[PDB]
Enzyme design. Sequence first.
Site, PDB file in Angstrom:
ATOM      1  N   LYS A  91       2.236  -7.946  -0.166  1.00  0.00           N
ATOM      2  CA  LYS A  91       2.958  -7.050  -1.073  1.00  0.00           C
ATOM      3  C   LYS A  91       3.234  -7.597  -2.471  1.00  0.00           C
ATOM      4  CE  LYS A  91       5.295  -4.538   2.621  1.00  0.00           C
ATOM      5  NZ  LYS A  91       4.699  -3.238   3.020  1.00  0.00           N
ATOM      6  N   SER A 344      -1.214  -8.584   7.887  1.00  0.00           N
ATOM      7  CA  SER A 344      -0.590  -8.147   6.642  1.00  0.00           C
ATOM      8  C   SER A 344       0.671  -8.905   6.242  1.00  0.00           C
ATOM      9  CB  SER A 344      -0.313  -6.645   6.690  1.00  0.00           C
ATOM     10  OG  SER A 344       0.343  -6.312   7.891  1.00  0.00           O
TER      11      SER A 344
END
Length: 363
Positions: A91, A344
């Site tokens: 992110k 992720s």
Amino acid sequence: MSPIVSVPDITAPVENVPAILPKVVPGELIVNKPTGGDSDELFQYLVDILASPVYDVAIESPLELAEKLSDRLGVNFYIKREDKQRVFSFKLRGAYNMMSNLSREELDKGVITASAGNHAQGVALAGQRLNCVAKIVMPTTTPQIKIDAVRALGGDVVLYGKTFDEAQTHALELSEKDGLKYIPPFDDPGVIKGQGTIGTEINRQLKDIHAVFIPVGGGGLIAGVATFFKQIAPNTKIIGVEPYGAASMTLSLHEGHRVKLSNVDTFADGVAVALVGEYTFAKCQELIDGMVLVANDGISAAIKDVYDEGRNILETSGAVAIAGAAAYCEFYKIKNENIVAIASGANMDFSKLHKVTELAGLG
């Protein structure tokens, strides 16, 4: 789409109940028929993705062959290790890309978002690199160690509300009031293009990919990666993965319009999203091959799988796509193909492994 600026959400509510899910087993493809998208718009995305300055903060993360998983499944099973970024998730990419496109004036005022997790860390990190104050709004009930994690990055954290929604609402209204730019976790072209740089890397690192499996919360990651991949390696399947108990993208695609889930299972907190993005839902309709669902035991078993490779721990959301990829391989008896799953993130409280071991043990 067009930017939604002021109106409240009125998306049709759906009662999140077992009877609504498509009746598929883990790994069974829920087919999407992609509409294609616009050539010029996709081209603009490609160029913006290639021009993105993400490497000011991010590395090209390893694309690792998982030996045990590969031997067990009889495929070449690769894991894209975004958990190896500075803030332990992908992110930082979207946040930096979007913020780096702001005017110096906007940055001098400062930016704001609401989060106590992965997005908060990306935004705070980008704020430090861009020499601008990032106000991160978190609920007052937030574990001190996460407040410290964001403060350690240089974030100006602010406590407010008891839930993420109240913190979020406060951050949004504080945004309009104080004139601070709001940094969205997913629903924004700038953010989508930042995550898309992962597509560039994967493609560079590996050709002839049968399928890339991608976790879907808001849809930023998959929209970004799919945008790159469907132009550059069109024969590769792009498949999103979600928990049965948080199947908002799957349900939206099935209905043909965004759908708001009445409640969501939070085991995989990062993908526990009741309402997918406006930009990201449209990109999924246009581009992806379909969706795959996994249960919490499958997610937990994927965390164990990766531990068994190298003793690294992924967070539940970070293991979702691995669970999906593995299940898909077994369901379709895939053999001798290249398979990629995106790891992720890896920001999970140590104590959560208590529940994860319990679920992983179910086999």
